[PDB]
Ligand binder design. Structure first.
Ligand SMILES: CO[C@H]1O[C@H](CO[C@H]2O[C@H](CO)[C@@H](O)[C@H](O)[C@@H]2O)[C@@H](O)[C@H](O[C@H]2O[C@H](CO)[C@@H](O)[C@H](O)[C@@H]2O)[C@@H]1O
Ligand SMILES: CO[C@H]1O[C@H](CO[C@H]2O[C@H](CO)[C@@H](O)[C@H](O)[C@@H]2O)[C@@H](O)[C@H](O[C@H]2O[C@H](CO)[C@@H](O)[C@H](O)[C@@H]2O)[C@@H]1O
Ligand SMILES: CO[C@H]1O[C@H](CO[C@H]2O[C@H](CO)[C@@H](O)[C@H](O)[C@@H]2O)[C@@H](O)[C@H](O[C@H]2O[C@H](CO)[C@@H](O)[C@H](O)[C@@H]2O)[C@@H]1O
Ligand SMILES: CO[C@H]1O[C@H](CO[C@H]2O[C@H](CO)[C@@H](O)[C@H](O)[C@@H]2O)[C@@H](O)[C@H](O[C@H]2O[C@H](CO)[C@@H](O)[C@H](O)[C@@H]2O)[C@@H]1O
Ligand SMILES: [Ca+2]
Ligand SMILES: [Ca+2]
Ligand SMILES: [Ca+2]
Ligand SMILES: [Ca+2]
Ligand SMILES: [Mn+2]
Ligand SMILES: [Mn+2]
Ligand SMILES: [Mn+2]
Ligand SMILES: [Mn+2]
Lengths: 237, 237, 237, 237
């Protein structure tokens, strides 16, 4: 199956599969069961920013979520991605709704990767930035119900004319060019990513969440991966 | 047909189709007949560097070619690419050999595009950089005889194990992701690029040349584009 | 005296010294008498963006000014800055008020410079970005009445408690590190800059303007350079 | 006293003050006694590369040192620089010789700092990159015997015309502009850096080492900091 490494912004607690009993941010390595988490003081109707970093020398993946004038929540996890992921991967963002729903609107997204070596000349580098989404992204791979709306916003899950989110939606958006995340002869490998989002919800318990994820080049939406599984995994093992 | 815009390093004079009678660097807008050229003091055996830029306000396309120690040769052409190219395109490099041959080895390649608006936040940006090539670049589209070797050098045209260049070869390598080169609402749209190449040849007169081109996303080696047509155009019109 | 190269956003027409009879943007090379201009459809109370570029191969300096949802004004000028400026320069922004006044509020500012050579390794590079100004910029050289306010905005000219601009004000802000803008052995030299501003004015004819300027490392405010002379030149020759 | 934070490439063991009995790379927080070290298989005569990173969320400081072909040696230390360093600082490199000597030649040097907030718009960013050094760098602060030579290499410590290293020399080179390393409102604050160096020595045991350090803006070679104290500290406390 697909090899996932993800940073999830889980807004709906599904304690039956391991979630903390509150909206949280967590680092997933190959399973929906976060190897580490932190409570996310989720504020709906407000735009949020997620910054994600990793460096093969520090072996530490970390993330943070902040709102304007609101403290940030942080989470980390020591891991050596060279043991988890294959050389060539493909990044993307995902989201879902189940019984309950929220808008999984991505307002911006950037990503940078380096494959350093002997000199100040990263043998490889890749960078992309979006401060607005095109009506027809020729450089995105939209999966499921994802789509860019009239305002140049990326909508990972179904939303209607009025702007009301729909339940039971799944959607992903992968960048088009596969990234070479590590090479045997590499000295350092880095990558940073940022994305902005707006989650608004009608029901008192919003669900389910958005994630930023790295995966094998051919990652496609798993069957039965909806709702609580955030379109990343088939089961909850 | 494909809508090409290229910068060529023509090593072989085909005076009968537009070439001056000497190695030259030219700018090609939709035809092999350069809208502008310059004498290139081609040095076989030395590694050379090519820089290329474009800024939709300055509306001028430039290109230099220098070798360590020896002087550079520049060439420009004022043009508004927003009228020549589609919004979405793919960038790439091509080379060819005809009756005569040379090695069309690419050692490094960068490219940066920025699509601005009302801030120091490019609504889009795209950057890639290669200082060595993977033996299976999953981010390059290799067309024709293009292949990356054991040394991590892109080889646009066939060479032998012993290193010898082969005749009659066409080769192209496009970056995988579509670049959003311009858009209606854009305020500024720019792009830079660099590549380093090494040309070697046993012939008294090496042929045919290397080009860095910008095409439509679905571009492909046109039939009968070998030799003097450098894998970009179907005929010499 | 100081060697100035500037892009001026002249809001007040001083026809007695060469200005067009309308607010305009112009490229100044060593004199307040713009070697080139364009009418700027100045909109007060609205934030504007100025993008400025230059490339030693294209020998063309260009600028553009846009507002959200308003067309842009462009201006250019072919020039070879290697003949105008010294190797080491120091960039900055300036503004003034004379009999009339406006707020010369800079909201952001970025700058990048390259000194390319034989390889994809710019022998030199410099880049700085500000999306907010520190209460005490240790990296700016504030000249005259310039100062960063409580909101992290840079105010080049006097403004009072209420936020009302004052007449007869001059102020500049130079970045701290001198930039190496060209070197004899350089193949290409580039630089791009962006800045955001907000001009608001009580009187019907706002004056005088803001400029982005490159100058000799020790550029200081010229005597009598106030009002119409934008703090750059002593006289109007 | 100066508040130093350094990464040292200690070539000479001064076991009596904290050094392991072998060439090592260490992280120094406010003292010559490394909070962490690693065996460095120092190779005289080969050019080496040092990469260093820090991310205030990951809160971990790392450093690698590799040579072409030979393996790299890494070293980290978890620390929150926001408690160790002032908001504004200057970066730099230092080196020294005592009874024994070696050449402390810096061939290249980059540095990038980013100070984030709520978007993919770093409220501040600063980047510089040198691939060769001007014979009169007006952007470097040279302290002690530091001097750039005819070949465009920074020489932290005295060498002769013939190239021979001299004993008892202290040398420092700081980038000119103050870096805003952190700020209260900041969400994320990171930094990367790279330098390439070449160490040569006639002595059976070369001394003393090179360091990349981060100090307070007004830093300066403390008296009696020669040799084993590598120009950073006044005493071995
Ligand atoms: C029938 O209850 C079970 O399913 C409920 C609905 O499940 C769907 O909707 C949720 C939220 O949108 C989504 O995560 C699922 O994948 C489905 O799409 C669900 O609400 C319910 O959860 C609650 O109850 C369990 C058991 O008591 C708790 O462990 C959870 O934390 C919730 O409190 C349950 O899974
Ligand atoms: C038969 O002569 C014609 O073709 C010759 C060989 O053509 C092939 O090889 C060249 C170079 O490898 C390549 O450009 C072509 O596409 C073919 O693959 C060619 O040498 C010859 O050119 C010369 O003569 C003509 C006419 O006199 C001149 O116009 C040229 O500048 C050359 O001097 C010719 O086209
Ligand atoms: C007395 O008239 C002259 O000076 C006037 C005031 O000058 C000061 O204020 C202006 C605007 O703030 C500033 O540019 C100057 O440097 C001084 O600080 C000025 O208003 C006036 O200009 C107008 O009249 C002349 C002559 O008719 C025209 O050529 C201009 O275009 C103006 O219409 C004049 O210089
Ligand atoms: C007199 O011996 C002490 O000083 C020796 C020389 O010191 C100078 O030179 C070294 C290296 O160039 C430099 O580190 C110092 O700062 C001075 O500039 C030194 O060689 C010697 O060290 C050795 O012996 C001590 C004590 O036995 C050990 O602790 C060390 O590891 C060395 O093996 C000593 O400090
Ligand atoms: Ca959940
Ligand atoms: Ca030809
Ligand atoms: Ca004026
Ligand atoms: Ca020592
Ligand atoms: Mn979870
Ligand atoms: Mn030609
Ligand atoms: Mn004017
Ligand atoms: Mn030590």
């Amino acid at each position: 199956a697909d090899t996932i490494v993800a940073v999830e912004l889980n807004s709906y607690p599904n304690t039956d599969i391991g979630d903390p009993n509150y909206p949280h941010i967590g680092i997933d390595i190959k399973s929906i069961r976060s190897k580490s988490t932190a409570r996310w003081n989720m504020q709906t109707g407000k735009v949020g920013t997620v910054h994600i970093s990793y460096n093969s020398v520090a072996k530490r993946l970390s993330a943070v979520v902040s709102y304007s004038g609101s403290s940030s929540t942080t989470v980390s996890y020591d891991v050596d991605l060279n043991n988890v992921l294959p050389e060539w991967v493909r990044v993307g963002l995902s989201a879902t709704t189940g019984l309950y729903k929220e808008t999984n609107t991505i307002l911006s997204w950037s990503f940078t990767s380096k494959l350093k070596t002997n000199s100040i000349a990263d043998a490889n580098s890749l960078h992309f930035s979006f401060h607005q989404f095109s009506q027809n992204p020729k450089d995105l791979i939209l999966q499921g119900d994802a789509f860019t709306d009239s305002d140049g916003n990326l909508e990972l899950t179904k939303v209607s004319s009025s702007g009301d989110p729909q339940g039971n939606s799944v959607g992903r958006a992968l960048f088009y060019a596969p990234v070479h995340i590590w090479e045997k002869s590499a000295v350092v490998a880095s990558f940073d990513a940022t994305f902005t989002f707006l989650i608004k919800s009608p029901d008192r318990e919003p669900a389910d969440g958005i994630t930023f994820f790295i995966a094998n080049t051919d990652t496609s939406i798993p069957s039965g991966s909806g709702g609580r599984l955030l379109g990343l995994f088939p089961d909850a093992n």
